[PDB]
Design a protein around this motif. Structure first.
Motif, PDB file in Angstrom:
ATOM      1  N   UNK A 130      35.778 -48.591  10.022  1.00 57.30           N
ATOM      2  CA  UNK A 130      36.406 -47.737  11.016  1.00 57.30           C
ATOM      3  C   UNK A 130      37.414 -46.840  10.316  1.00 57.30           C
ATOM      4  N   UNK A 180      36.017 -54.285   8.677  1.00 61.40           N
ATOM      5  CA  UNK A 180      36.035 -55.516   9.454  1.00 61.40           C
ATOM      6  C   UNK A 180      34.731 -56.274   9.254  1.00 61.40           C
ATOM      7  N   UNK A 209      36.420 -60.848  15.192  1.00 62.53           N
ATOM      8  CA  UNK A 209      36.365 -59.945  14.065  1.00 62.53           C
ATOM      9  C   UNK A 209      37.370 -60.398  13.015  1.00 62.53           C
ATOM     10  N   UNK A 210      37.306 -59.773  11.856  1.00 61.19           N
ATOM     11  CA  UNK A 210      38.374 -59.903  10.898  1.00 61.19           C
ATOM     12  C   UNK A 210      39.538 -59.008  11.256  1.00 61.19           C
ATOM     13  N   UNK A 211      40.680 -59.291  10.645  1.00 58.95           N
ATOM     14  CA  UNK A 211      41.903 -58.558  10.933  1.00 58.95           C
ATOM     15  C   UNK A 211      42.008 -57.241  10.172  1.00 58.95           C
ATOM     16  N   UNK A 212      40.932 -56.788   9.543  1.00 61.10           N
ATOM     17  CA  UNK A 212      40.900 -55.488   8.915  1.00 61.10           C
ATOM     18  C   UNK A 212      41.225 -55.546   7.434  1.00 61.10           C
ATOM     19  N   UNK A 249      40.824 -52.377  20.917  1.00 55.31           N
ATOM     20  CA  UNK A 249      41.820 -52.497  19.862  1.00 55.31           C
ATOM     21  C   UNK A 249      43.109 -51.850  20.336  1.00 55.31           C
ATOM     22  N   UNK A 256      46.193 -52.275  15.507  1.00 57.40           N
ATOM     23  CA  UNK A 256      45.781 -53.664  15.377  1.00 57.40           C
ATOM     24  C   UNK A 256      44.265 -53.729  15.275  1.00 57.40           C
ATOM     25  N   UNK A 257      43.774 -54.924  14.995  1.00 56.93           N
ATOM     26  CA  UNK A 257      42.366 -55.118  14.755  1.00 56.93           C
ATOM     27  C   UNK A 257      41.541 -55.113  16.015  1.00 56.93           C
ATOM     28  N   UNK A 258      40.232 -55.175  15.811  1.00 58.50           N
ATOM     29  CA  UNK A 258      39.300 -55.184  16.922  1.00 58.50           C
ATOM     30  C   UNK A 258      39.288 -56.555  17.578  1.00 58.50           C
TER      31      UNK A 258
END
Ligand SMILES: CC(C)CCC[C@@H](C)[C@H]1CC[C@H]2[C@@H]3CC=C4C[C@@H](OC(=O)CCC(=O)O)CC[C@]4(C)[C@H]3CC[C@]12C
Lengths: 105, 350, 127
Positions: free
Chosen positions: A38, A87, A98-101, C40, C44-46
């Motif tokens: 993203x 992610x 999901x993962x935290x990025x 989101x 912050x994350x998804x």
């Protein structure tokens, strides 16, 4: 139930580098996880499904691998369009996490 | 008194060895089928048709080397039953989880039980029913528990048509038992002529791809012919006909074929040996021990998926639920065979 | 022909009220695939919200929204709705409607379906 602890939250890498983003699931997920990227201000593109396979349209730099639960995305040579947040997502059990990025810069 | 197991095994050792062989053949058959149909996801009908052709000629060669006027009508009935079985299975496996498939095998146990009671007049002991309810309840509970959690899509009607696929394979298994243990037809002649009529009934399977709720295998009326020609182009030569936008969430599965004939040949050999040893078990012992030795493959596929050598790059960890499915199977089959032993002892004692 | 998932209903809503979002899907058939909303928050994350299989009608929710949200689908018009009720201040976020693209591996006695979130919508902001 399952959470996907993602490797390094943010890594700094110049152009032409080989970056490796890791995410370990809690319990034994199968090969069925995916990887998205993203950019700031857009929707997440799908990069990899099933932890090894390139989605149609994705260039050949991205690749996925696994050994148990420690999934690993890797890029052969970064380019200025590969700077975004990455992610990972499991598809085994129903609480989807999901993962935290992971922000590349 | 725990020394009696040795005599009980040494009396009738061939069935356990044949179950070992069928295990080693069925797991490898399914493994190589999913390994080649991951290499050729399209062209499935062509793969099955070529497989049936080589099954036919191989079984005729073996019949020439080793082996009411004629039973061509009965062979055609067997093949048409198998054909509608694979129809209803191919339809039902579109919306069906991987756990409900094992539960469906364990539900092919009592379907076979009741239909062998009804048609060809079996007599069942107490312990046989106890073993069947034991195995089915155990594996049903655990696989329904696992299916509440999986993200794999599921619709009850498709599981029901999977049971409807189990029905005619039971008809075919018990009618080949009839034509074996009544008229004493040879195994190899039967399998050759069955494969002949299976070529024909698979070319009549062909119109099932027309309907569109298939995900990736749907083919309209226009491009069934080109799919066949491209399938021969992929298998027999190695030409890849789809390398552009393809894969997940798209029209067709991506295909590699430059060395796929080898994997297809191994799959066909293992399926040939599967059908052969199946007919041997059905002729020699019963059409009811066969369903047990065919339901071994449910837990055993999960056992074999733990290894990367067998299952390539998509393996799993040894959770206890797979082990309790395995051991529930074992306890149910052991008490079932004990019931069969009491029944045989009461029959031979009189 | 080409796949799209365009949403609506986003905007400002008071804390402790109702809001209905509606993603209309183009090209593909809604019945033959999952459809799920993923949010989101700013920076912050998804985070997964809900999901629906419209053919089976099977609905699933996340742990923070269960009992408050309601996902649904009208496959006659080929769209998908998400109603959010008893809204809090921490549910403000950009919401994407998205489907599972499915890969159907099939051996002649079984089938494994793998999933990945194929097409995402552009996203609607909620406050
Ligand atoms: C290291 C492993 C591979 C060797 C030991 C495992 C076997 C001893 C297990 C696995 C599968 C089990 C078999 C599964 C199916 C059958 C068929 C079953 O047949 C019947 O139900 C009645 C048959 C008849 O007597 O007519 C008898 C039990 C048996 C041999 C089971 C015996 C125990 C077996 C062979």
């Amino acid at each position: 139930d399952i959470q996907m602890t993602q490797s390094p939250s943010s890594l700094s890498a110049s152009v032409g580098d080989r970056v490796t983003i890791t995410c370990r699931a809690s319990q034994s997920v199968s090969s069925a996880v995916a990887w998205y990227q993203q950019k700031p201000g857009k929707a997440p593109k799908l990069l990899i499904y099933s932890a090894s396979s390139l989605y149609s349209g994705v260039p050949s730099r991205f690749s996925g691998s696994r050994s148990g639960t420690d999934f690993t995305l890797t890029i052969s040579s970064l380019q200025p369009e590969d700077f975004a947040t990455y992610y990972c997502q499991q598809s085994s059990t129903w609480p989807i996490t999901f993962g935290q990025g992971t922000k590349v810069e | 008194v725990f020394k009696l197991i040795f005599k009980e095994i040494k009396d009738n050792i061939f069935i356990y060895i044949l179950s070992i062989i069928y295990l080693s053949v069925s797991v490898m058959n399914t493994i190589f089928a999913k390994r080649t149909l991951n290499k050729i996801g399209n062209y499935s009908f062509v793969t099955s048709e070529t497989h049936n052709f080589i099954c036919m000629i191989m079984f005729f060669i073996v019949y020439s080397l080793f082996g009411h006027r004629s039973f061509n009508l009965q062979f055609f009935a067997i093949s048409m039953l198998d054909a509608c079985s694979v129809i209803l299975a191919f339809i039902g496996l579109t919306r069906t989880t991987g756990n409900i498939q094992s539960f469906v095998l364990q539900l092919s146990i009592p379907i076979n039980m009741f239909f062998c009671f009804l048609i060809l007049r079996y007599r069942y002991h107490l312990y046989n029913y106890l073993g069947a309810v034991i195995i089915v309840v155990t594996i049903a509970l655990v696989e329904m528990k696992l299916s509440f959690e999986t993200q794999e899509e599921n619709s009850i009607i498709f599981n029901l048509v999977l049971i409807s696929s189990l029905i005619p394979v039971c008809f075919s298994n018990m009618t080949r038992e009839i034509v074996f243990k009544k008229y004493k037809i040879d195994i190899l002649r039967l399998n050759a002529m069955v494969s002949f009529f299976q070529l024909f009934t698979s070319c009549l399977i062909l119109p099932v791809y027309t309907l569109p709720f298939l995900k990736q295998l749907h083919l309209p009326y226009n491009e069934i012919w080109t799919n066949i020609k491209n399938g021969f182009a992929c298998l027999f030569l190695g030409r890849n006909t789809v390398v552009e936008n393809c894969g997940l969430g798209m029209a067709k599965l991506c295909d590699d074929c430059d060395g796929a004939w080898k994997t297809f040949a191994l799959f066909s050999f293992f399926d040939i040996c599967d059908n052969l040893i199946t007919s041997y078990i059905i002729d020699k012992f019963s059409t009811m021990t066969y369903t047990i030795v065919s339901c071994i493959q449910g837990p055993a596929l999960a056992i074999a998926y733990y290894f990367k050598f067998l299952a390539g790059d998509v393996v799993r960890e040894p959770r206890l639920l797979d082990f309790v499915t395995l051991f529930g199977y074992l306890f149910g089959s052991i008490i079932y065979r004990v019931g069969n032993i009491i029944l045989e002892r009461k029959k031979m004692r009189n | 022909s080409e796949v799209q998932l365009v949403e609506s209903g986003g905007g400002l809503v008071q804390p402790g009220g109702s809001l209905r979002l509606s993603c209309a899907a183009s090209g593909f058939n809604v019945s033959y695939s999952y459809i799920h909303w993923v949010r989101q928050a700013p920076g912050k994350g998804l985070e997964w919200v809900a999901s629906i299989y419209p053919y089976s009608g099977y609905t699933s929710y996340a742990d923070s929204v269960k009992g408050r949200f309601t996902i649904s689908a009208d496959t006659s018009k080929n769209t998908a709705y998400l109603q959010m009720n008893s809204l809090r201040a921490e549910d403000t976020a950009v919401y994407y409607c998205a489907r599972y693209g499915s890969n159907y591996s099939f051996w002649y006695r079984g089938s494994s379906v793998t999933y990945a979130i194929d097409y995402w919508g552009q996203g609607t902001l909620v406050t």
